[PDB]
Structure formats: structure tokens, C-alpha cells
Design a binder for this molecule. Structure first.
Ligand SMILES: Nc1ncnc2c1ncn2[C@@H]1O[C@H](COP(=O)(O)OP(=O)(O)NP(=O)(O)O)[C@@H](O)[C@H]1O
Ligand SMILES: Nc1ncnc2c1ncn2[C@@H]1O[C@H](COP(=O)(O)OP(=O)(O)NP(=O)(O)O)[C@@H](O)[C@H]1O
Ligand SMILES: O=C(O)c1sc2cc(Cl)ccc2c1Cl
Ligand SMILES: O=C(O)c1sc2cc(Cl)ccc2c1Cl
Ligand SMILES: [K+]
Ligand SMILES: [K+]
Ligand SMILES: [Mg+2]
Ligand SMILES: [Mg+2]
Lengths: 308, 308
């Protein structure tokens, strides 16, 4: 399970579990979308009037309308059709974070209470992550991947998922700087446990891009020889901790209180940190930074284990 | 002086004080209007979209535009023209409280944070009172009323101003119920001191209408014989206290925590109490209620004396 939300791990011969899942989505999602719509309605007028914000607002209204218009799920035939609608919405909404970032960038300056946008984005993006997890889980329940029940991996290796995103971030970095730091992984490298990869897929690349940009930008004289990023995995009975340590010079004192703000960037829109922290906390975890100004940064991602 | 705002009591032979006053308004008002416009811009979208709210928003923008368009005041000729604009705006904006009450009535239900409207109305209505006091003072500086310097009365009798509003409220009450309670005034009935009547003119009739409605509605069997409203004046070196005591049955326990809310009424829009308290507090005073459920209510208006 996740916040106020359960991921059904049930399997059934008749496929009755797909019906149960679909029915669950149909009770759960419209309410959650409705809350987000209320969120748009309460946005400060000048932000709510932004055409890009209006577009997302309308997308959410349209999502609510489609889900509520969909008939009661009675049989596998209905459920199959329902999955089509779910796939459509997941796709129609795939650029929502980008749209919000864009619509909010200028318009948020025109209000006074800056805490407002932070609260709206935290609440909206985390609710969205939840919606997407539930929807994607339902679709995945049709899949027959070994080691998966829906989007729940029954034997996730943190080392493997880290390596996947390391390769991804190194590719981006190499394309931009001609090189990329190597990454060493230590600690509980052999750990394997039930876990939902999705949040890691969101968070890991954000933290890795940060460490790599910082490293390259602080070693412009020696792009061909930069210090490794070092990642430590700690697996215990309560949580999983992933520490990502760079020698990229640190987060400057004058920036430290701003890096967690949406839209703050020293370079994207500056969303990597605030989004990652919101997601971690939403899931019962945390994201903490330790800056060694002049040397580098240690970033600690903590995520709670799945309860059985 | 009043909050962050000074009422110029200067008199001058050449009339140079009118120039100084006008110039002061021209520096002060646009900023204050601008802050109120920012207030409209930050209203929750769904409220800001209300056509009546939009109308007031536009009125404020138009007021800002006109003041800022008006040329620098150089001579009595300019100042005379300026007074025309001031009179126009005072008049164009005379129904603003009513418009806000109307535009907010339904739309405020659609947001979550109810504290929001209270804060907006408190801030907007008090800023408005300040704007109107300054504008009206400037115009009044042209007048030659004995005992007045602008809107500042140099020898206000609280008994006299109370009697003025007593007659007014009794007329309304009599028209509605066929009778009205008599009002007795005691305490410092002979008090006279420098004071700005304007806030009393706003507040006194609101509190008197309340006491009289309560009295009539609790004595439906004997409309021709209802208990007096009793008003006590206490004048000291710090403040003026006006206690208005009725035998109208009290404010019920179930209503007590709601009577200070805008839009709450057991019957207007339900604005008398929250507006009166906002105004009192804005001026450094207070408005406090003591309910004797089953008997009546004591309402205490406190306003600070003018500093010399
Ligand atoms: N490991 C790090 N070392 C040094 N600076 C960092 C590090 N991580 C983050 N920062 C700084 O923190 C700022 C904000 O990070 P972030 O929120 O992830 O936005 P961004 O990287 O600038 N753009 P985005 O692609 O949206 O994430 C960066 O721009 C940097 O100034
Ligand atoms: N002296 C009183 N005795 C009994 N009830 C009172 C008294 N004063 C106020 N109330 C109650 O408080 C409520 C709100 O008062 P108020 O804010 O002044 O709005 P209102 O009188 O209902 N309408 P309005 O014309 O806008 O002022 C009233 O409707 C009554 O229920
Ligand atoms: O905003 C989003 O990303 C999504 S995906 C998604 C999928 C469904 Cl089935 C319903 C709403 C919804 C929203 Cl809102
Ligand atoms: O809202 C109001 O009542 C008023 S009276 C008024 C008079 C002037 Cl001169 C300027 C703005 C202004 C406003 Cl805003
Ligand atoms: K940021
Ligand atoms: K009220
Ligand atoms: Mg980033
Ligand atoms: Mg009233």
C-alpha cells in the first residue's frame, strides 16, 4: 500500500481480480481528480488565468468527466475498454509537470504569499504520482513479467535500478560535456526485496543529473578526468537509504535556502529537488542534503520498505 | 493621524496647505490602490472570476489609472480639478462593500481555506476606510465648519453622535416592527474631545440596528412595550468606550463562534459585526461581545483617543 491508497497484489484464476481492481480505480480516481480540480479553482486568480495553467485545469476536468461518464464495470469486456481510457489519460497527461512548471514560472511572481505555489505544487504533483501509480498498477496487472505483481517488484535490486539510471544520466552528461563522472556503488550491493520502482525512476535520474552537472561544471579545466560519484546503499528492516555523494564543489551558502524551491536553478525549470523531496515524503520517506562548500554534496534519499 | 496615514490639520493663509494635502494624496493613494489590486489578483481563481468581483477589481484598476494619469499638482487650479476627480471616485466606489458582499456570497463556498475571505475582506475594507478618510479629509479641508478641521472634529460629543444614530436606527426599526426600543445614555454624557466621527458613523448604526432587531424579535408578544437599550459612555485619557447593552435575549451558544464571520446572518449580508470589528481594530481599537444567553448582549466598542 501507499498513502491512503492500496496497490492490490491479488491474483485470481477467473480474472476476477482485474474486475476488482478496475472497480477500485473507478471509486478512487474521480475523487482524487476532483480534489485537484478544487486545487486549480483555489489558485490565485492571476495564476489561474495563465493559459497553460488553464489548459491543465481543463485536462483535469476532462479526466474527471471521462471517468465519471464510464459505465459501471461489470465484466472483462468493460474492464478491457476501461484500460483503453486509462492508457489514454496516462498519455494525455504525461507532460503535466512541464506544463505546470511553464504556466507557473512567470505568474507566481505576481502574488505575495510564495508559500502558496510550493504547497500547490507539492500537493498537486504528489497526488498525481499517486494517481499514476494506481493507474499504471492496474494496467500492469494484465502483464506477465517475472518478479512483478502489477508495478510491485517482488525482488528489486537497488544496485540494478541505480545502474540503469546511472547509464541514462551519463549519456546525457557525456552529450553535453564530452565526458561524465564514473559512478561507484557500495554498501548493500546484493540487496534484494519487494519494492515499487516507479518513485525511484522519477527520483534517481534527477539526483544523478544534479551530481554530474555539478561535477562537470566544477572541473572545466579537466573534463577528461573528474572525480567519481559515489553511491552507498543501506538496506535495513525499516527503510532503504541511497546516499549519492559527489565532489562537485557543494551547494553554496547563498543558494542553500533556495535550491529546494520550485523554479530555482543556477543553470530545466529547476524542479528536480523539490519534486524529488515531495515524492519521497509522500511515500513516507525523505530527501536530505549535506553541502560541503568547496568540496561536494551528499544527498540522502530514504524510502520506507513495503509492509507485509 | 491614523494607521501609516496622517490627517493633516494644518491651516494656511495662502492656501498652500491644500496644495500640500493634494500632493500627499497623490503620493499615498495610488500605492494603497495598487496593494488592493494585488489583493484582487491573488483571490482564489473561482472567486476572482465572479462577475461582481471582476467589476470591483476593474473599478480599482480604473481608480489607479485615473490618479496616476492626473498631472503633478502645481497650483490651486490643479488642486481644484483634483478635488473633482476625488469626488468622482468616492462616488463611483460608494457601493463597493455591497458589491464585494454580493460577489463573495456564493463563490466563497467553493474554496477550502475559509480564513482566506475573512483576511481579504478585513484587509480590503479597512484599507478602503483609510482611503476614504484621507480623500474625504482633503475635500473637507476646503470647508469652513466650526469645530472641524477637515474630517477631524475638535470637540466631538459622543452623546450627540450616538443620539444621531439612535434616531436613524429607531426609524428603521419602527418602520419594520411598528415600534423601537428607547435608548438611554449614561456615563460621561458631557464628554467633549477631538475625534474623527467617520468610523463612529460606520459602526454605531450597525451595532444599534443589531440591538434593536434582537430586542424586537425577542418581544413579539409585546411590540408596544420592549426593554430599553442602554448605552454607557466612558471617556478616559487612553480611549473612548461605548457599551451598548440590550435585553434582546443574547447571542445563542451555537451562533457565538459564527456571528463575527462575514456572510453569517440569522435574518443585509451579515456584515455589520465583522466590518465593525475590522474598522475598530484598524484604528487601534476593538469590538468585544458579551452574550448573556436568555437575557441580552453587551457590546463594547473601544476607540483610541487622538494623539496631540
Ligand atoms: N549535487 C549538487 N551539487 C551542486 N549543486 C547542486 C547539486 N544538486 C542541486 N544543486 C544546485 O541546486 C539547484 C537546483 O537543483 P534542481 O532542483 O534539481 O534544479 P535544476 O538541476 O537546476 N534543473 P532541473 O533539470 O529542473 O532539475 C541547481 O541548479 C544547482 O544550483
Ligand atoms: N445584540 C444582538 N443580540 C442578538 N443577536 C445579535 C446581536 N448582534 C448581532 N447578533 C446576531 O449576530 C448576527 C450577525 O450580526 P451582523 O454581523 O451585524 O449581521 P446582520 O445583522 O445579520 N446583517 P447586517 O445588516 O449585514 O449587519 C445577527 O444576524 C444575529 O443573529
Ligand atoms: O495528471 C496525470 O498525470 C494523470 S494520469 C491519469 C490517469 C487516469 Cl485513469 C485518471 C487521471 C489521471 C491524471 Cl489527472
Ligand atoms: O473603494 C473606495 O471606496 C474608494 S474611494 C476612493 C477615492 C479616491 Cl481619490 C481614490 C480611490 C478610492 C477608492 Cl479605491
Ligand atoms: K530547484
Ligand atoms: K456576521
Ligand atoms: Mg536538477
Ligand atoms: Mg447587523
Amino acid at each position: 500500500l501507499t498513502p491512503t491508497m492500496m496497490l492490490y497484489s491479488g491474483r485470481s484464476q477467473d480474472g476476477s481480480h482485474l474486475l476488482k481492481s478496475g472497480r477500485y480505480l473507478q471509486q478512487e480516481l474521480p475523487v482524487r481528480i476532483a480534489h485537484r480540480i478544487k486545487g486549480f479553482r483555489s489558485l490565485p486568480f492571476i495564476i489561474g488565468c495563465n493559459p497553460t495553467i488553464l489548459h491543465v485545469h481543463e485536462l483535469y476536468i476532462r479526466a474527471f468527466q471521462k471517468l465519471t461518464d464510464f459505465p459501471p464495470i461489470k465484466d472483462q469486456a468493460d474492464e478491457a475498454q476501461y484500460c483503453q481510457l486509462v492508457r489514454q489519460l496516462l498519455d494525455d497527461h504525461k507532460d503535466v509537470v512541464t506544463l505546470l512548471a511553464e504556466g507557473l514560472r512567470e505568474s507566481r511572481k505576481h502574488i505575495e504569499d510564495e508559500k502558496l505555489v510550493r504547497y500547490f505544487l507539492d500537493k498537486t504533483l504528489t497526488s498525481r504520482l499517486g494517481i499514476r501509480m494506481l493507474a499504471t498498477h492496474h494496467l500492469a496487472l494484465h502483464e506477465d513479467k517475472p518478479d512483478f505483481v502489477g508495478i510491485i517488484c517482488t525482488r528489486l535490486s537497488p544496485k540494478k535500478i541505480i545502474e540503469k539510471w546511472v547509464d541514462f544520466a551519463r549519456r546525457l552528461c557525456e552529450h553535453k560535456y564530452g565526458n561524465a563522472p564514473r559512478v561507484r556503488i557500495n554498501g548493500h550491493v546484493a540487496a534484494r526485496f519487494p519494492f515499487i520502482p516507479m518513485p525511484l525512476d522519477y527520483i534517481l535520474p534527477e539526483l544523478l543529473k544534479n551530481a554530474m552537472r555539478a561535477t562537470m561544471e566544477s572541473h572545466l579545466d579537466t573534463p577528461y578526468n573528474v572525480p567519481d560519484v559515489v553511491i552507498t546503499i543501506a538496506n535495513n528492516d525499516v527503510d532503504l537509504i541511497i546516499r549519492i555523494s559527489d565532489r562537485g564543489g557543494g551547494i553554496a551558502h547563498k543558494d542553500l535556502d533556495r535550491v529546494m524551491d520550485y523554479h530555482f536553478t543556477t543553470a530545466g525549470f529547476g524542479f528536480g529537488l523539490p519534486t524529488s523531496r515531495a515524492y519521497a515524503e509522500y511515500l513516507g520517506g525523505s530527501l536530505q542534503l549535506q553541502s560541503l562548500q568547496g568540496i561536494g554534496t551528499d544527498v540522502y534519499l530514504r524510502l520506507r520498505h513495503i509492509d507485509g
